[PDB]
Write a protein of this length. Structure first.
Length: 301
């Protein structure tokens, strides 16, 4: 309804990127790895570790008098592409903005390891941090989960696993996630041919991740919106994008949570596209929208 952001549109014309399966997974991962990215907060301490067999990268916030909270970050990329390096900047932005130790999880990727491999990896690291976070200098009593796109789906699913296993999450930050698999929502039609993610790509990556799941009654670990109840999971901030086919997905997920009594905040950056964290520190409207969600999560921790 409001126009696509003017700076965003100049950026999208200089480097037009489309998330698609074209050329196979290796070409797709290469197109995503090759996008030019601004380095964000490079001073921050980072370390590589392996946690319960899952490769991880750990970031520390600016050292302060207080012991920081810990946040698990689940990168996006349609459950197929993405890695610690192309998300390095995004993880650092979370670390500085939330003031938290951030654990970026390098989960297994489809199609080589389809559903539920990603869930097992992000969950294993979430279990490990909830018990061993002080070993990093973080407060294990202050934990949250964050994820974008496919990683937003992983973050919403991990919060249900955490509620049922007794892991206390104080918040879940969902950047433009894929929680419902409802293609009938309005944004899938309004934004079917949108700049970063279209409706074909949404359907393609779901099939590569979980081709053999009957979606008439799928498990909640695939579609978090289909859980018996969403009551009891950590409060939600859902950052949604106007020109994204998944916009109404996140907004619907906010409605289902509130109907189950869950504290839920949804913000719609109506002038932005899917994956606007990739423009952090580049597209001003993207940094501002990102900084809002980062601030709310700073308070809840």
């Amino acid at each position: 309804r409001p126009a696509l952001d003017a700076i965003l549109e100049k950026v999208l014309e200089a480097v037009p990127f489309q998330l698609t399966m074209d050329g196979g997974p290796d070409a797709a991962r290469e197109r995503f790895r090759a996008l030019p990215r601004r380095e964000v907060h490079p001073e921050l301490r980072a370390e590589d570790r392996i946690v319960e067999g899952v490769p991880v990268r750990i970031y520390w916030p600016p050292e302060s008098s207080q012991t920081p909270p810990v946040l698990l970050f689940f990168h996006g990329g349609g459950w197929v592409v993405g890695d610690l390096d192309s998300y390095d900047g995004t993880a650092r932005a979370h670390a500085a903005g939330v003031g938290a130790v951030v654990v970026s999880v390098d989960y297994r990727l489809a199609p080589e390891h389809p559903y539920p491999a990603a869930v097992e990896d992000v969950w294993a690291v979430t279990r490990w941090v909830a018990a061993h976070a002080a070993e990093l200098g973080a407060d294990p009593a202050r934990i949250a989960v964050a994820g974008d796109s496919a990683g937003g789906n992983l973050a919403a699913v991990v919060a249900l696993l955490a509620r049922d296993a007794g892991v206390r999450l104080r918040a879940q930050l969902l950047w433009y996630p894929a929680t419902t698999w409802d293609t009938s929502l309005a944004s899938f039609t309004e934004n079917a041919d949108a700049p970063i993610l279209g409706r074909r790509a949404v359907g393609s990556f779901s099939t590569l991740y979980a081709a053999d799941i009957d979606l008439s009654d799928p498990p909640a670990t695939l579609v978090p919106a289909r859980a018996a109840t969403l009551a009891g999971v950590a409060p939600a901030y859902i950052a949604v994008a106007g020109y994204d086919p998944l916009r109404d997905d996140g907004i619907r997920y906010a409605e289902l949570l509130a109907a189950d009594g869950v504290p839920a905040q949804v913000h719609n950056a109506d002038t932005l596209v899917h994956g606007y964290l990739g423009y952090y520190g580049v597209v001003p409207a993207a940094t501002e929208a990102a900084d809002l969600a980062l601030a709310a999560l700073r308070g809840a921790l």
